[PDB]
Amino acid sequence: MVGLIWAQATSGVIGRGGDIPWRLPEDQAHFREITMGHTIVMGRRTWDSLPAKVRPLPGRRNVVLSRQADFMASGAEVVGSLEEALTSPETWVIGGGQVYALALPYATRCEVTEVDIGLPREAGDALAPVLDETWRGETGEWRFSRSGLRYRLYSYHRS
Ligand SMILES: NC(=O)c1ccc[n+]([C@@H]2O[C@H](COP(=O)([O-])OP(=O)(O)OC[C@H]3O[C@@H](n4cnc5c(N)ncnc54)[C@H](OP(=O)(O)O)[C@@H]3O)[C@@H](O)[C@H]2O)c1
Ligand SMILES: O=C(O)c1cnn(-c2ccc(F)cc2)c1OCCCc1c[nH]c2ccccc12
Ligand SMILES: [Co+2]
Numbered sequence: 655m656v657g658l659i660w661a662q663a664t665s666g667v668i669g670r671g672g673d674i675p676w677r678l679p680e681d682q683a684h685f686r687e688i689t690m691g692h693t694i695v696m697g698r699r700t701w702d703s704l705p706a707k708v709r710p711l712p713g714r715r716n717v718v719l720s721r722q723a724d725f726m727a728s729g730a731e732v733v734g735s736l737e738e739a740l741t742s743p744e745t746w747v748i749g750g751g752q753v754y755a756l757a758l759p760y761a762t763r764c765e766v767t768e769v770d771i772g773l774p775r776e777a778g779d780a781l782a783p784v785l786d787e788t789w790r791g792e793t794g795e796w797r798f799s800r801s802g803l804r805y806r807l808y809s810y811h812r813s
Contacts (some may be wrong), residue, residue: 656745657763658754659688661805662782663773669750669780673703678799681767684807685748688765689714692744695736697753701727715742719753736760751780758783764810770796771803788812 661681662668669675690713698720701709709729710716716730717739725732733739736756747757764785775781794807 656760661767766808
């Protein structure tokens, strides 16, 4: 099983300038729970976004996808193809926008956090993948985060 996991604004934005224009501390803990013990696939730009003490994220097999044959990720494995990284009974692609789409053929789970932030779409932003009509969503209750933004959890599922 390959899953995708991301947070997004009501508009689809997941990242700008190589980072995230929000931080919900509740979102970060559902990320760790959902991924703890499994494999995480990220692109080099997203690994590049993790600070040097936080990487590799703990308790997990950190796989970085990259076209540089000689790029290094201390504590992580660097694979040149997405499907090379798919070796565990549970794989979680943790972004960003380029890998969400590339991993989207392989995925049966989409855990999406929708952040009610008015963030207009802008050039160079990374986007959540467009989920086609084969995906079936469960919708949670609207919640309040301590960062002041409200959020909600979508659980898309498909055979
Ligand atoms: N939940 C969230 O809101 C969330 C989650 C994660 C990340 N983010 C945001 O996502 C944004 C970054 O996403 P991104 O779309 O800019 O870059 P990315 O998807 O993070 O990684 C892009 C890199 O992956 C490699 N790559 C791309 N296509 C490939 C392919 N077909 N085969 C092999 N390797 C390939 C290349 O590395 P080389 O150039 O080294 O080849 C490319 O530069 C950041 O802003 C981050 O904050 C947000
Ligand atoms: O998982 C961990 O063990 C962990 C602990 N601290 N941090 C961390 C949080 C913020 C930050 F700026 C640096 C490190 C972690 O990374 C996970 C954070 C959840 C997250 C939201 N969007 C993401 C995009 C890519 C990758 C992880 C995320
Ligand atoms: Co688990």
